[PDB]
Amino acid sequence: XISIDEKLLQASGILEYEKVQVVNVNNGARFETYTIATQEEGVVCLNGAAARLAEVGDKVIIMSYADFNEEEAKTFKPKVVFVDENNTATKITNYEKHGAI
Amino acid sequence: XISIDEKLLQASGILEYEKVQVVNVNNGARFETYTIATQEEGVVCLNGAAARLAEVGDKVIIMSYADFNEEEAKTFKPKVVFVDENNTATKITNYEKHGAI
Amino acid sequence: XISIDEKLLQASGILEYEKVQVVNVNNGARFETYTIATQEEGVVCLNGAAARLAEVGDKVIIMSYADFNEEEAKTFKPKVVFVDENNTATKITNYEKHGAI
């Protein structure tokens, strides 16, 4: 694979070549792949086998996960990036208690 | 995503934002997502792409996993929470040998 | 399972018995299994249940993943192996920034 605007990788703190789970709201597909960065603005491109799991225009949610010890886990707040129809970031924040944004 | 009554997260020791495997007894679907806590009692709500993998009323089993060294693993007992039709906890215990509850 | 020419395991730095994600470009299948090495040149053979997820001639992408601390992750470059129609390596390199090869 998933080639993603480097701006969105930066905003979400997802590294190039990081494993991500991608889920497609339109068709319900769920898969794992790794990211590739592109300088081309607004791009979210599914390459290879993943191409069969989406069509242009589909809405996807791209997630990265990490492992924590129990103590660190208690206080960790995930980073969330929201975008507009052009894949431009509109909000970058961290989750608060009870899914608050 | 899965928004879950904070009472059930507390009972199971699953943290908000923890990765969980969710399996649907009605339709056999199996997926991974992360939890969101809600103060609203009895709620188990599938958001986003996961919405396509269940209908209201479906029975689901929600599991979290952890990594252990070999020695710790020998003696670890998972936490199990059973609920009624209203998603109210009816039993909270730990597995004993041979799946005993 | 997946029995793979030891030459390709060597080239990619994937160990025998390592967990791999295999995705099939022809049919979109995605699965995880482990590798078995074979001395037989050019072989990529799906054994067991995985046999139902490909036909001879299908193009597959075989990936291994690893866990890193945040600092090491910043500078890690994955190894990539490209092959010809006979599964002979044509290029072995590491990813550079922005998916450059």
């Binding site: 191409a51 989406a54 996807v60 990490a66 995930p78 | 990765k19 | -």
Partner: peptide
């Protein structure tokens, strides 16, 4: 010691702009 897995970050509802089956890279 026991490790658990949390969501680290997400990009919510991005739009797919291209889907390239035969990608070489």
């Amino acid at each position: 010691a026991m490790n658990i897995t949390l969501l680290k970050s997400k990009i919510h509802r991005a739009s797919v702009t291209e889907a390239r089956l035969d990608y070489i890279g």
